[PDB]
Design an enzyme around this catalytic site. Structure first.
Site, PDB file in Angstrom:
ATOM      1  N   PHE A  40       3.537   4.247  10.194  1.00 59.70           N
ATOM      2  CA  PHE A  40       2.656   5.004  11.074  1.00 59.70           C
ATOM      3  C   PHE A  40       3.351   5.217  12.417  1.00 59.70           C
ATOM      4  O   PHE A  40       2.704   5.315  13.454  1.00 59.70           O
ATOM      5  CB  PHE A  40       1.327   4.286  11.355  1.00 59.70           C
ATOM      6  CG  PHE A  40       0.534   3.897  10.129  1.00 59.70           C
ATOM      7  CD1 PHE A  40      -0.303   4.776   9.445  1.00 59.70           C
ATOM      8  CD2 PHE A  40       0.610   2.590   9.696  1.00 59.70           C
ATOM      9  CE1 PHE A  40      -1.008   4.335   8.318  1.00 59.70           C
ATOM     10  CE2 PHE A  40      -0.082   2.152   8.595  1.00 59.70           C
ATOM     11  CZ  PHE A  40      -0.894   3.018   7.903  1.00 59.70           C
TER      12      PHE A  40
ATOM     13  N   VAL B 187       8.051   1.039  15.913  1.00 58.37           N
ATOM     14  CA  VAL B 187       7.535  -0.146  16.591  1.00 58.37           C
ATOM     15  C   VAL B 187       8.670  -0.875  17.300  1.00 58.37           C
ATOM     16  O   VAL B 187       9.787  -0.971  16.776  1.00 58.37           O
ATOM     17  CB  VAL B 187       6.831  -1.101  15.602  1.00 58.37           C
ATOM     18  CG1 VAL B 187       6.180  -2.249  16.347  1.00 58.37           C
ATOM     19  CG2 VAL B 187       5.813  -0.338  14.767  1.00 58.37           C
TER      20      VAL B 187
ATOM     21  N   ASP C  42      -7.175   0.029   3.182  1.00 61.19           N
ATOM     22  CA  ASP C  42      -5.827  -0.113   2.653  1.00 61.19           C
ATOM     23  C   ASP C  42      -5.359  -1.553   2.760  1.00 61.19           C
ATOM     24  O   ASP C  42      -4.238  -1.813   3.207  1.00 61.19           O
ATOM     25  CB  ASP C  42      -4.875   0.818   3.404  1.00 61.19           C
ATOM     26  CG  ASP C  42      -3.520   0.920   2.743  1.00 61.19           C
ATOM     27  OD1 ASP C  42      -3.425   0.630   1.530  1.00 61.19           O
ATOM     28  OD2 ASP C  42      -2.550   1.294   3.437  1.00 61.19           O
TER      29      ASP C  42
ATOM     30  N   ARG D   6       1.467  -5.499   2.603  1.00 62.06           N
ATOM     31  CA  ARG D   6       2.318  -4.696   3.473  1.00 62.06           C
ATOM     32  C   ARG D   6       1.657  -4.347   4.798  1.00 62.06           C
ATOM     33  O   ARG D   6       2.349  -3.882   5.710  1.00 62.06           O
ATOM     34  CB  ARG D   6       2.723  -3.408   2.750  1.00 62.06           C
ATOM     35  N   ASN D   7       0.349  -4.552   4.924  1.00 58.85           N
ATOM     36  CA  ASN D   7      -0.382  -4.283   6.155  1.00 58.85           C
ATOM     37  C   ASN D   7      -0.772  -5.557   6.894  1.00 58.85           C
ATOM     38  O   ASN D   7      -1.442  -5.477   7.930  1.00 58.85           O
ATOM     39  CB  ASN D   7      -1.624  -3.435   5.861  1.00 58.85           C
ATOM     40  CG  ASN D   7      -1.272  -2.053   5.336  1.00 58.85           C
ATOM     41  OD1 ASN D   7      -1.357  -1.794   4.136  1.00 58.85           O
ATOM     42  ND2 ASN D   7      -0.865  -1.161   6.234  1.00 58.85           N
TER      43      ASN D   7
ATOM     44  N   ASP E 235      -3.346  -2.795  10.859  1.00 55.09           N
ATOM     45  CA  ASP E 235      -3.391  -1.432  10.346  1.00 55.09           C
ATOM     46  C   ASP E 235      -4.732  -1.215   9.650  1.00 55.09           C
ATOM     47  O   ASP E 235      -4.821  -0.525   8.630  1.00 55.09           O
ATOM     48  CB  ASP E 235      -2.216  -1.152   9.407  1.00 55.09           C
ATOM     49  CG  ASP E 235      -0.921  -0.867  10.160  1.00 55.09           C
ATOM     50  OD1 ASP E 235      -0.980  -0.302  11.274  1.00 55.09           O
ATOM     51  OD2 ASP E 235       0.158  -1.218   9.635  1.00 55.09           O
TER      52      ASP E 235
END
Ligand code: A1BI1
Length: 265
Positions: A19, A22, A127, A131-132, A145
């Site tokens: 997204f 970072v 979601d 991975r988040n 996220d």
């Protein structure tokens, strides 16, 4: 709250995420923070900003605390708690043989607590996956996220048939009806528990997305991981009921988790 970039410092690059980019840095000198520079053209910005204000007012120890945003310039900046150990998926993989089942159950309790707080605020993740999730300096797992997918413009990322949609974490009602609910976040949490005890293996690794969707539709469920006790498996399995109303809330899940953890002492 809004942040004046005057009060931010860029100290290191952590990498580019899904997204946007970072970086690691310091806010107001004394605050370790992770600054995400959103990509351009990817999000519905005004809507995204308003939801950012909502996720800013969410606070919980097991939620990656959001400290603020810089929106009166572009790209939007998002200033968040710094999680030194990065994504949970790679933390799981690098420390694969560096875990005890007590630590795995702990990471699941951490996530479940964060999702029970998100449940109580009527806030959906949409979601949930390893991975988040991120890991801090002490080894605690926290969700991140959350709610980000509601404002993604790429229809591959949003549509049920998109090439990037996380079918393998999706409940049947999300694939077939796009009916996101806290029960769909619970299904996703079940899959996440399976990720944790699998030490980060991709669920249905070799099935195509379509094959997965259909198999799910016909009753297929992930196999009990090798590191999962039959009680842990019973818990992550209760998240995967075909009927949404038959799935237990995150609170009932947290209770079951603590009962098993106590019996694992
Ligand atoms: N905070 C953080 N600390 C430490 N690394 C972080 C991050 C964030 C992050 C920043 C801002 C966020 O904004 C939010 C927060 C909550 C809800 C919505 C948006 C959410 C998450 N991203 N990365 C890294 C970025 C590239 C890949 N990464 C790796 O580790 C590589 C080793 C594999 C992770």
């Amino acid at each position: 709250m809004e942040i004046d970039p005057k009060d931010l410092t860029f100290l290191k690059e952590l990498g580019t995420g899904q997204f946007g980019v970072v970086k690691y840095g310091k806010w107001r000198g004394q605050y370790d923070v992770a600054i995400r520079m959103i990509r351009e053209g990817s999000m519905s910005e005004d809507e995204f900003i308003e939801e950012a204000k909502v996720m800013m007012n969410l606070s919980h120890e097991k939620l990656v605390q959001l400290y603020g945003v810089c929106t009166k310039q572009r790209p939007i900046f998002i200033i968040t708690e710094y999680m030194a150990n990065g994504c949970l998926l790679n933390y799981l993989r690098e420390m694969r043989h560096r875990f005890q089942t007590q630590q795995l159950l702990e990471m699941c309790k951490d996530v479940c607590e964060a999702m029970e707080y998100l449940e109580s605020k009527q806030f959906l993740h949409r979601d949930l996956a390893a991975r988040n999730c991120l890991v801090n300096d002490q080894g605690v797992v926290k969700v991140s996220d959350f709610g980000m997918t509601r404002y993604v413009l790429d229809d591959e990322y949003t549509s049920s048939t998109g090439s990037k949609f996380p079918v393998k974490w999706a409940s049947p009602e999300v694939l077939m009806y796009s009916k996101f609910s806290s029960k769909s976040d619970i299904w996703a949490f079940g899959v996440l528990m399976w990720e944790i005890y699998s030490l980060g293996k991709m669920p249905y690794e070799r099935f195509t997305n379509s094959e997965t969707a259909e198999h799910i539709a016909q009753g297929l469920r992930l196999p009990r991981p090798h590191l999962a006790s039959e009680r842990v498996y019973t818990i992550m399995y209760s998240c995967w009921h075909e009927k949404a109303d038959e799935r237990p809330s995150f609170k009932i899940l947290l209770s079951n988790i603590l009962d098993v953890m106590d019996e694992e002492s």
